[PDB]
Design an enzyme around this catalytic site. Structure first.
Site, PDB file in Angstrom:
ATOM      1  N   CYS A 131      -4.533  -2.168   2.212  1.00 32.31           N
ATOM      2  CA  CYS A 131      -4.499  -2.916   0.781  1.00 32.31           C
ATOM      3  C   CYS A 131      -5.732  -2.430  -0.681  1.00 32.31           C
ATOM      4  O   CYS A 131      -5.068  -1.796  -1.325  1.00 32.31           O
ATOM      5  CB  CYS A 131      -4.284  -4.747   0.044  1.00 32.31           C
ATOM      6  SG  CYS A 131      -3.057  -5.306   0.610  1.00 32.31           S
ATOM      7  N   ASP A 144       2.833   1.903   3.152  1.00 32.33           N
ATOM      8  CA  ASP A 144       4.175   1.287   3.474  1.00 32.33           C
ATOM      9  C   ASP A 144       5.682   1.605   2.855  1.00 32.33           C
ATOM     10  O   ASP A 144       6.578   1.799   3.335  1.00 32.33           O
ATOM     11  CB  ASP A 144       3.890  -0.022   2.271  1.00 32.33           C
ATOM     12  CG  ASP A 144       2.882  -1.089   3.475  1.00 32.33           C
ATOM     13  OD1 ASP A 144       2.070  -0.806   4.398  1.00 32.33           O
ATOM     14  OD2 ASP A 144       2.107  -1.427   2.203  1.00 32.33           O
ATOM     15  N   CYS A 165       0.627  -1.311  -0.087  1.00 37.24           N
ATOM     16  CA  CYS A 165      -0.062  -0.009  -0.038  1.00 37.24           C
ATOM     17  C   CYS A 165       1.173   1.431  -0.295  1.00 37.24           C
ATOM     18  O   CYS A 165       1.703   1.229   0.136  1.00 37.24           O
ATOM     19  CB  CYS A 165      -0.918   0.043   1.554  1.00 37.24           C
ATOM     20  SG  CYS A 165      -0.434   0.439   3.270  1.00 37.24           S
TER      21      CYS A 165
END
Ligand SMILES: [Br-]
Length: 208
Positions: A159, A99, A96
């Protein structure tokens, strides 16, 4: 905005069983090399028996492996996503958008990050170092955040819904057609980077 709930759910998502947090930083550093990581390499770095490495990874059901059974994904991944994360001459990816802002401090390296606006498709890119971001293109780049109250594991929702956007207004317009979607928030990429810094501060305090 108030970020404590977001930091908390991220931290709660990682400190599942002993050792996940302990294995995460060395694993990220190895994946950043751009090749699949063996259990035995991890075991050597941690000075754990390899079966203990396997036991902790067993808990992390979302870990990605290749056809050889070696690790190729955990947050940072060798399999293509919409979040390109380049280190040295190696092209990696992330699960994602947030991250990509967190990992550079953990791996201790600067990354060239690129993606496309989830709402318009426009390319977006920036340079993320352990302590700062630069070359933010376009300068008003935004990030979406979610707060599933409550998922033990925030991985799935992030996600699905944690992206980069070309701007805050574009992101907020996108967010407006997600009526009822829980804890959905838009921040600037600077604010998201700050979130990641605070997350990293807490995460690293919990390690020995
Ligand atoms: Br709060």
């Amino acid at each position: 905005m108030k970020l404590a709930p977001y930091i908390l759910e991220l931290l709660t998502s990682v400190n599942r069983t002993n050792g996940t947090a302990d294995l995460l930083v060395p694993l990220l550093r190895e994946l950043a090399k751009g090749r699949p990581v063996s259990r035995t390499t991890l075991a050597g770095i941690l000075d754990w028996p390899a079966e203990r490495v396997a036991a902790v990874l067993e808990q992390a059901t979302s870990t990605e492996y290749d056809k050889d059974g070696n690790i190729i994904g955990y947050g940072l991944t060798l399999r293509e996503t919409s979040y390109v994360f380049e280190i040295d001459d190696r092209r990696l990816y992330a699960w994602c958008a947030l991250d990509t802002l967190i990992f550079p401090a953990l791996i201790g390296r600067t990354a060239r990050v690129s993606s496309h606006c989830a709402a318009t498709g426009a390319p977006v890119s920036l340079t993320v170092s352990p302590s700062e971001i630069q070359a933010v293109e376009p300068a008003g780049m935004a990030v979406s955040l979610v707060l599933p109250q409550e998922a033990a594991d925030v991985r799935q929702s992030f996600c699905c819904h944690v992206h980069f956007f070309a701007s805050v207004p574009t992101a907020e317009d996108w967010a407006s057609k997600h009526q009822g979607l829980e804890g959905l928030a838009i921040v600037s990429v600077h604010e998201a980077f700050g979130l990641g810094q605070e997350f990293n501060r807490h995460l690293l305090q919990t390690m020995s």
